[PDB]
Structure formats: C-alpha cells, structure tokens
Amino acid sequence: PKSYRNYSKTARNPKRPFEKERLDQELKLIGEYGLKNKREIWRVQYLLAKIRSAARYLLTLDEKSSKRIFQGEALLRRMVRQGLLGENEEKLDYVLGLTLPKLLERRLQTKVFKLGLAKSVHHAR
Amino acid sequence: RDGRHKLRLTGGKKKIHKKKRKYELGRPPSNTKLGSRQVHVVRGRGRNYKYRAIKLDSGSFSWPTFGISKNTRIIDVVYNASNNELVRTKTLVKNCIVVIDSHPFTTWYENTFGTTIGKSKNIDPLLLEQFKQGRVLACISSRPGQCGKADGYIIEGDELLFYKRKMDKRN
Amino acid sequence: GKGIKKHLKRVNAPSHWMLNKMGGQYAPKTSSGPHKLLESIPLVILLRNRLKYALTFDEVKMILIQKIVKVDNKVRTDCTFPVGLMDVIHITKSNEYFRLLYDIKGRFVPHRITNEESKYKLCKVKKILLRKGRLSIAVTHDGRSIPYIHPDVKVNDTVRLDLETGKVLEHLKFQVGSLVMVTAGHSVGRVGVISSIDKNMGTYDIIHVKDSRNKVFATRLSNVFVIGDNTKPYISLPREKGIKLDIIEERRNRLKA
RNA sequence: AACCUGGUUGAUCUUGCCAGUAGUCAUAUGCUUGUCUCAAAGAUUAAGCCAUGCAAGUGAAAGUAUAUAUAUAUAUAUGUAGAAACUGCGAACGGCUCAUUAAAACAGUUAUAGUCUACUUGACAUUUAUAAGGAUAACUACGGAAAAGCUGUAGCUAAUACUUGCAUUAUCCUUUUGGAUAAGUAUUUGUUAGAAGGAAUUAUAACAAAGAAGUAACACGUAAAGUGUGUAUCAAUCGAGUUUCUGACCUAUCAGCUUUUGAUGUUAGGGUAUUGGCCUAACAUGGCUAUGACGGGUAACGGGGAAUUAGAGUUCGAUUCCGGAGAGGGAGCCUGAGAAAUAGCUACCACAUCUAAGGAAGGCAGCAGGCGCGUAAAUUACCCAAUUCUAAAGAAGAGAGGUAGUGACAAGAAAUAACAAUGCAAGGUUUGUAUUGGAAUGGUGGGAAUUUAAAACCUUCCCAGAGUAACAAUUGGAGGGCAAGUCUGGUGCCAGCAGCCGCGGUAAUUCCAGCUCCAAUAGCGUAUAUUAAAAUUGUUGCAGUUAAAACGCUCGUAGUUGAAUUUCAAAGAAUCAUUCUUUUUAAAAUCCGAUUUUGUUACUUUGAGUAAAUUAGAGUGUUCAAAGCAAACAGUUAAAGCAUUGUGUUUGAAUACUAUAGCAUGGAAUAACAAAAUUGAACAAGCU
RNA sequence: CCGCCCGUCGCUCCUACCGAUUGAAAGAUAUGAUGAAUUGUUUGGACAAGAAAAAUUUUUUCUGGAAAAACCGUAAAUCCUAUCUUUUAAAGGAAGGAGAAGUCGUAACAAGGUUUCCGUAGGUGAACCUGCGGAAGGAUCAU
RNA sequence: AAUAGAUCCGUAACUUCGGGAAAAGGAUUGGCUCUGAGGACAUUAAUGUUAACUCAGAACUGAAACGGACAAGGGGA
RNA sequence: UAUGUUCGUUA
C-alpha cells in the first residue's frame, strides 16, 4: 500500500527564535553569501552537525579500533573530496573544526562568483 | 472442542476469542456393542480414514505364552477397569475383559503339539480349566473405534488371577 | 480458511535475492522442490536479475517454454523452481554451464564452468536411512534419495554424484583436514580447513574452521558443506575463492584501480 | 546545542508552581499559495447502515465433441479449430479492518522421540487383454412459476467421471551354469532379535493373526526411445497444529481464589492427525497467591518500529512487513490436502429487498461510491504494460497490483530579478543610493521529440512571450518575556486586547486604523495531545527542623543489606627514561628427567543463530537534495583484452544492530551456594 | 493601625454531595425454564436396481436408499430471577467556589488589648468561649 | 384459593453479629432392573460364615407422572 | 495589671 521510498528533513529550527546575537550573525552570513533564506543556513548547519556528531563519536573510540579506523578514513576522504579539508589537515581532530563559512564556500554560486563569470554572488545565484 | 474454555492453572477464567477451529474437531464416541459386524468410515484430517466399529462379534486373539494368534469369536463382556456401565451394556473398548471361545486354540494345540520354533512352554492348570469349560478370558488390546476391529490376548498368570479375583473376600 | 500462503512480498523476500523495494509489491515465491525457499533462488531471478537475459517475468516464461535450460542436466520449465546450494545449470542455446555457489557475501552467484566440469555434483548427505530389506538410502541437501550408498558414507559426508546417471563416484568425510564451505551464517560462503569439531551433547555441535590465512571462524555443524579433502577443493570456486577479507582493507583494493 | 526567561515583594534570597520556548511520520482548523519532485489519505466517533457496478477464474501437444465451421489427394482418410456441458484444478491465496483479547495474542528461544501436510522434487510397487460394464450431463420434444444463478417428465450419448479386471520375482546348494525353496504397501494386535540418535518400545528383522489403498482397460509426439495425467510407500519441500523457557500498561476503595458444573493429580478408556481433563468412570485433595493470585479498567490487537533523546528516560505504534483475530451478532456444518470459509451452506437474533401476498432472495471491516456520524479523511476513473498468483499454465483472468484524478498530511529542491552610467551621502577618487536601458530567464500559450497499456506529468527542441518584470507574498506581531514605534488619528474602564505580568477613566509605545518596522516565508497562525524544558517523579538525579513531607514509640515477618580470613613474586626480549610481552613456584590421576585435568552459579569476554522495511553506516554527482540501488569504462565511428576469425568489459547491492531470556565459550577479581566434628576421612595389610 | 482581617446571616450563579421514590435506563455475567438448527447412532422404508418362474404378469430375497421419528451431543435464541458495571430523575437537606462595594460583631496579626497554637469534651448568632493535658512556632535562651 | 414433605442449590437490606432465614427463589421426587459405599465373627502376610436399613449413581418404563390419597409456610417493600 | 468598637471598592 504505502510507498517504500524514504524522505527526511534536512533542517532543524533553531529554538530560542529571537537571539539578537544569533540573528545578526546569521544575517551577516546570509547577505555575504547571497542566499535566499535562513532555512538554507539551517540546512548547512544541520549537515555540519551531522558530520560533527559522527566525528565526535569517532574520537571517543580508541585508535586502532576497527570501527574508528574504518569510518574515520571513510569520513576523512569524503571531507577531502568535498574540499572542506586540505593537505595541511589530516586527522580526525580537524573535521571538528569546520565552520559554516567554509561549508558555504563550496556552494555553486560562491564558487562561480569567486571564479569570475558573475560579478556578484547575487548575480551568480 | 479441545484446548480452551478450561480454567487457567491458577483457577482463573480466561476470556475467549478465536472461535472453534475445525482441527480441534472432537468426534462423538463409538459405543461399540457386541453383535453383527458393522463398521462405518470416518474421514479424519488429511483424508485418512478411521474405521469406527459399531458392533463386532469375532476377533483376532493371541495366545501370548506361545506367541500365536487365531481368529475366534467374542462371547461376552465381563469386566472393564473404567465405568461398570460399559460392561453392563457390553461395549468393547481397548482394555475390556471378554470371554473368548477356546476351541480354535485347543484345536491348534492338538494339531501342532499333539495330545491335549521355541515350543514346549508347559502351560498352566488355571488356563486349561477354562479350556475344558470351552470359554476363556481375554483382554482386548486394539481400539475398536479407531481400527474397526476387536483384537486381544488371552490373560494368564498373575494378571489373570488378578482379574478373576476382581470379577469374583468377594461375592 | 487458513491454508498455505502462496504470495511473497518483496520486502519479505530473502535478502540475498536482492529485490529492489520500489520494483513491485510481490516476489516470486519459489515452488516447493529440491531446496528450501530460503537457501535457493527461483529461475525467474536466475535468468532475470543475475544473467539479465530476461527483462521481465513473461520473458523468463518465454525462455522456459523452449526446452533450453536444464537443472542437473534435465529440462526444467517452472519459473519458480529452486536452483539450490550447489548444482549445475546448462543453457543449451548459448552452450554455457553454471554452478550455483555462494560468494563470500552469502549471495547466490552463477559460476561459469566447463562442460567436463558440469558432470560432477557435490551433494551433502543429510540423512542415512535403511528401508525394507536392509537397503540404505542417503537423503542429500539437494533432496535426492540415493539408494545402496557405500556403507562408509556417514551423515555429514559429501558425495560426488554423476549428473546423467545419478550414481555416486566418491565420498568425502569430515576430518579436521577436510575443506568445507559455509552455508548460512555470518560467515556464509567462506572456505576453510576445519580447525576442530566441538561436539556438545543435546545442542548444536559447533565446528571451527581455518581460512587460508589462518583466520578461525566457528559455525553450526548444519551450516557446513564439505567441498574437498586437504589437497584441493573438488570444484572450481568463484573469483573470491571463498576468502572473506576484512571490510577495512577491502576498501584498499577497491581504491587501488 | 548537556540553554533557559516573565510572574508572589517596598525591595531581597528561596521553595514552588503558572506562563513563555522548541519539536512531533500529530490530528483538526484559519489565512495564503507561482514551479517541479515526492505521496499520507473514513483508523479516532458508528466492527454503524448500504442503492449501483466490478472484485476468481481457468483449455495454443497431451480427459470427454456427429452443436457447428473450414481446408488438403480422391462418398473416404488426415485435419484445423470449436458454443455448450461433464470431468480436473483453483476459489482456504490475496485484499480489508482492529471489535474482541492482560500470561491471552505477540516476540525471542525450544520440542514435535506427541502429529497432519495438496501442488512441486527424488526415489520406486504387493495377496475380452489385438482391452470389460451401466448412466449421466450437454442436446431433442412437452411444461410449471409474478419472480429467482428454480427446475419436472420422456429419449439418447462419452470421458483421466463411476465401477470391474489381464505375468513375475527373491532365496539354498554341487560352485558362467542346473535343479530346490518362498511370495500383502501402509495400518492394527501378540511374541521376539535389534545404521543412527542425547536418550528408542527407532530403522530394520523373525514368528502368528488381520488388512486399507494401489502396481496404467488413460492421452499427445523428441533424438540425424519423449512428454502429459493418475497412482502405494518413503524422503524432500511449501506449510500448519500443538509445545518449552523468558518477557506487558493502570488498579488493593480487588486478599484470598479454584474445586457439585474439571479445579490439581493418579489409573483405565473414549476422542483426536497427534500429546493432553480434551472428554468419561473410579480414586486422592490437590493447584495459584503480597515476587499481587482472583477480580476491575484500558478511549489496549502484539511485534518490527515512531517522536523526543548529551546520557538516563518519557510518550506513541488502528496503518507498508510478520503473527493473531473477524466478516451485522452468535452457533452449526458440507466439500476439501487444507475452512468451523462467510462475494459456501443451515438456523436463531437485529436490520433489510422483491412479491401477483402464494413465496423468493441478503451481508462493501474487498474497489469505487452513498447515507449517518462526527473536528476529522479522495474517483461510482484507465489498465493488466510492470510485480506476482490461479488455471486444462505464453496467449485467459486478477478494483491483487499498477496508472492517472482529488490532495498546502508530511518530505526535498527552488522564482518573485541581476547588471552599467550620471544626482545624493560617507571617505581619501572607494561603497550605498533614484533616474534611466539594454541583456538573461523562467511562469504562460502553441507545436514536436519523447514518455506511456493508452494518456498525463517529468526532460529536451522550435515559435511568441517581462518594466509599475500589475507575472503586483503572505502570515503574525512591535510594553516585558521576545525581534521590532515614547509616530499620527479614533475610542475614553466603553469597545476591546491580553498564553503570563498587565493595557484601556484625554499624550493608550498594549484596543480600533494609517505609516513604519520586526519575524518566519510559499508559507504563517490557532486548538488539543505529547516530548524536551522537568534534577517539578529524581536509577543516574529531587526534597522531608522552619517552604509539602520522619509513622507517637518499640518489637517484628516478607523484602533489602551484611566484618575480616583460604596462593604471594622474581627473572628476560621490545617504544621513551618508563611501559609492554613470555616462563616457574604446592598437591592428586595420564605420559620413561620430561611430556597434563583438578566445585556450581551470578557476573564478565568472545562466538554461534539472528527477515526485510526503518536505523546506524561503506560505495555511488538522481543536474543538487529528499532519494534510489544503481551503475562506470574507450569507441564522428576501433584498438585492446581473449578465441581457436568473433566474443563487450569492469563492478555494487557491504558491515553493525536484532532483547534482559535461551545455546557455546576464556575467566585470576567481586558476590553468593555446596562441602566442613556432641566427630568425619584416606592409605597399607588380612577377610568377605 | 484611618493597616490587615475572620465567621455566621441575607441575594445571584456554578460544581459536586446525601436523598424517600420496593426510583429509571442501558449493558455484562450466572443459574433456571423453554429451546431453532445440526454432527453421530438407532428406528425407518417413497423407491431403484438385481437374482426365480410362467412366454404380459407374480412371490420371495440381497444390498443401496428419500421423507419422517427418537436418543446422547454441539447449541443459537427468548424468558424469569439474581448480581455487578455505567449513565441519569428527584421534594427536601447540606457543602464549596465565584461575585467591586450587603447586615452583625472583632476572632487573628502589637502582650491584637484574655499570649497564640495542639488533642479532647461541653457550650454559644457569629467569629468563638470554657475545662483537662500538652507545645513555643512566646511576650522568658537569664541569681 | 395459592406450595406447603424431603433432598440438592441459592439466599438481600438491616443487625444488638446471636440473627434476619424455611428470606427471596430454582431443580428433583413413581415403578422396575442393577452398580457402589458403610459392620461382626478364625485360621497358619494369607481364605470362609453371617446382619441392619441407610446413603449415592445408572439403565429401562409410563397419556410427563410420581411428598399422586393423607399430611402440609403464601411470600415481599 | 477597671472599659474603650469600626474605617466601603479601585487605582
């Protein structure tokens, strides 16, 4: 009867809806990356929370544990593929250090504006 | 007709769902009388046939001390360990005690041993007294309502003495 | 009424069949026959999901109508026919011969084999029983009954049956040097030399098995299929050769390309 | 993200709740709504009631054809088919719903050495024969009834329908070979002998009695003998029924229940497919219970799972899968391998249809659809193309199922512009900023490719098609909590707002409006429920002098808890300065200076066996994402690999989890229990 | 302290309670009575086919057998009785709460003008008063 | 007038806990043929002789009737 | 150590 295909939510509402110091930071980010809504930054930080949660779980596992020395390089090679980590970053300790701007710099519109093509991030969008 | 509607182990009453299934079934008893051979056919689960014997008069009966079996006829029903109403109405059941014609056995003894494998069992007096009377006591060993025939074995020795004492410190 | 169920939902189908969730509501319920539904695949998924010859059930039926495919060198035309743990499939039109084996991930794969190879069948005897006249019959994992088996044959042995005649050729025992293939466990598909046979009175007897790389894995005795003696397996094995590699370092061979 | 804030006061610190806050695969509803993907949907209350129509049928070699039609060389032979009907199989699956149900069902874990099992698969059989019998459908003629899936009489005819019924093998011996001997499959009874299982009254074998059912009086044709159908038994398989251990919410203003009426057990039997008080007869007085029996409640089908989770938890699970139960309520029964079946039958109860009034026929909690109910839920659509099932099995069916329709239930992506020049502002000729004025692009319409069972959508291509881009974004707020006005009017303790604190009597930052601003945004409010917040249910982890709260006091059973004590170190190789690995050192039974077992459990470690969906998680650019389980690789037109002239090749669909209970397993610590003296051992010799 | 504040008595509304009425209703169990339908068994016995003779007819017999009946059993359903559960009527009685502003007094908070309070008993329009024994949460940490 | 004996079952409010109570209210009952249970007495673990009517159960039987006449509470609020 | 009551509601 019911369809078997999945569906999930990719964003979480922040709770505490009127933090001035959060609203200002998030508006700074919205404007400077030219994105349409704060739901988008919510998606990005939901993603980042997922990666951070996985990494934080891995750090509790001791080194040379099979689970850690499987999923750690799985996650690490995925991160370097996304480009969030460079050659100068190599361990599980640096995935914890990723931030919203370095996640947003991989969006298509920011990349194209940086590469030229468009003279503004809004023009790129 | 089986399994449910009883009280629990503790004595508590069990709420019932799951109305009666056919595989519980529970067919009515066969009160196998003693008389002319008539049997009926019961179709059990899997189309396996069960022969429900309404009346039998003869049967295969075994002399066990010699390990032989001969076909004789049942004369009367004289005891059963369950309800006495069964013997009073002369019904054949798996452990009923019946009176059996002795002549096929005595004739077989004449023919094989002479005179009135691993032979020469020396017999006993308590059984040949019945033989001289002509009618002998036997215990049914089959289930007439299940197989459709009454078969049994002559009782001798301590079990025979037991049953004779039970039938007849006594009246 | 409550007679036998005749449908199989896709998500209820065995996992090793690999039936996609979104591709229909039902799965092909294998007909009763030589092997259990759980430890066999139907011909529909043998010729539709593995060999990709057919694109649909009707095409599988079209294949089967022409008496082309044979299982144990006899024609089979039932779409839901159990193939089995190990047995030969012959596609005559395309001349090719398969044996159903387990890969180290416990999934039924058709191993390409040669015409000369396709006359030997390894049958794991499961019951030895004597019938009237003291004639001994061996019931095998395949489900065949082989009468007048050699008295030396025991319950957990294996026999090499000749497909065309159904006669035993030689039997193999279950010593601690005999190589075996695992049938249904976590370690389904591995091939190893039997470390030992831990027998416990009244419950499942466990047997420990050494891989080629001296890795020991234990299993229930019922999940074991003697494949050869200590010299070599009596069958060609799939490309993995029945060696299960750790997930951490299978990634290394995947990455190197 | 392991979080708090407003409110008791003149002010303060508490306790403590109220209120705020966020989520909900959680329902309803208000306002609003441009794209595409994706897809829940009459469960809540009424397992209430139903008009209509559909939902299970089936013949491609293989039972039965002078209904009948046709075709080939010459009235013949082969045919090709075939309405109807008999026969066979299926209709016991599927689909729906959740009323019942509280050790019941269900789950994990066993047993069936206590049983049944159609189709399918493998083995394989025993006490007129150049082919046996009647009798029936279809059909023909005559009818009855208002009506019905009603059927009377007479006459024919077959069948794989129904019923009878026609070689032979094995053993003993002189010993390829000759004579002699013997003949029941399951099942039942009696007396015996005895490949395996953990244990046999097992397999099997012998003797003595019975003895089913069968071993083809049947149909069509493949290698340059075959298949179909049917059949005894065994086995396998698809399953089922019982069954072991362990696991469930609230309630003691339910404390004693069960036992004539079977309650607990023994013995005998009946019944069953089998075990069993399942039932009967006799007998005994048992069985459960504060570790909660027996009751009551549940707005309770159980589980896989869902929401919320830092960790513990709390709440939910009618609903994709599994198991159960039901077909208005009960009960009964036929056929059948399988049903206590309900689009099967029989009856009662309640509803309810036709009737000529005599009588007939009914069961949507199947798919649509209607009424009712309610806060609360879609089309009387298209199709068997996929998935799969039934069949006499390619070819027919299937409201199973799929496709579309309705669809702001949820979920994902994502428009409502972007850009250049001058005025103006900031500043050392840099940013913001209304005028212009050209590019870009969808939304829209039309055609096409394509898609599809057909169609639609998606995708792609060609035409027009944006300046107030009128192709015009909303919802809810602006005293505090809590982001945002001491702006302008109106009302004037009214009307009204206000979750809470409060505002409103002429300066209303709070009502009714305008402007502005804030917040989230194709979404935003409201109600109820629930989670966190709540360390305000506290095991982790609360409090009890005075905020609520130590029984008046002591004894005391259950429960919970319980002192210390029984075998301790040294030596070596390896990272950096330490750490890390190996060996022995009592005693009793095995091995001729050396070879090897030494309570029970809890507990802990490893395993085994764990359905998927969901979850975690590996891989993979669905244009991204939700997803899905796929896919990737060279080829303006071929090399390569390999095949002895062609054959694509390389892959994935992993792992983890699956209680606490059960099986196996290493174990030194910590805990119990066992053994241990008003006495109990062992050894040697003699004796039995 | 021109502070705060208690209770009776009056008025209105809301909630719940007791209540004669052998109150009412709807369910659910249990016993009893009656008891449809039906399994099984027995009794039946419309007939439907065989076997004999007479050379169209008849007797007897063997099964198979339909109505119908009986008896055990499975047992719907209705009725009576009892018990329980849920809902609900009611003269009258008697609480509580909520009213912006009632009457009467002054009980408590200051030594609250008789210190307060507890248990218990009696009494009074009301708060309350009195007896006995306690407490300090007292107005005394004290010759 | 209504039963009314006996056996088995069931029995409320209230209560001075003794009662209420035969509460209320159900069922059964003849004859016949049987089955079971209940004692006393003597012999070398064992076998005979003999007695009361009292209960319980079952078949059958009849114009469904059976404390068959006699005898014998009406109950309840 | 004779008696000496009360202060309507809201802000």
Numbering used by the authors:
A (entry chain SE): 2 to 126
B (entry chain SL): 5 to 120, 162 to 213, 216 to 218
C (entry chain SF): 2 to 258
Authors' description from the paper:
Building upon these important proof-of-principle studies in ideal systems, we use in situ cryo-ET to reveal the native translation elongation cycle and its perturbation by a species-specific translation inhibitor in a non-model organism of high medical importance: the malaria-causing parasite Plasmodium falciparum. As such, unlike the model organisms characterized in previous in situ cryo-ET studies, purified Pf80S ribosomes have not been extensively studied in vitro or in vivo and the molecular details of malarial translation remain largely unknown. Here, we present nine new native structures of the Pf80S ribosome, including eight active translation intermediate states, determined using in situ cryo-ET of P. falciparum-infected human erythrocytes, which elucidate the molecular details of the malarial translation elongation cycle. Our in situ cryo-ET reconstructions reveal an ensemble of translation intermediates sampled by the native Pf80S ribosome, deepening our understanding of translation elongation in eukaryotic pathogens.
Upon proper base pairing, either the E-site tRNA or PfeEF1ɑ dissociates, bringing the ribosome into the decoding-2 state (with tRNAs in the A-site and P-site tRNAs and PfeEF1ɑ still bound) or the non-rotated pre-translocation (non-rotated PRE) state (with tRNAs in the A-site, P-site and E-site and an unoccupied GTPase site), respectively. The presence of the decoding-2, rotated-1 PRE backrolled and non-rotated PRE states together in our parasites suggests that dissociation of the E-site tRNA may occur independently of A-site occupancy, explaining why the E-site is only partially occupied both during and after decoding.
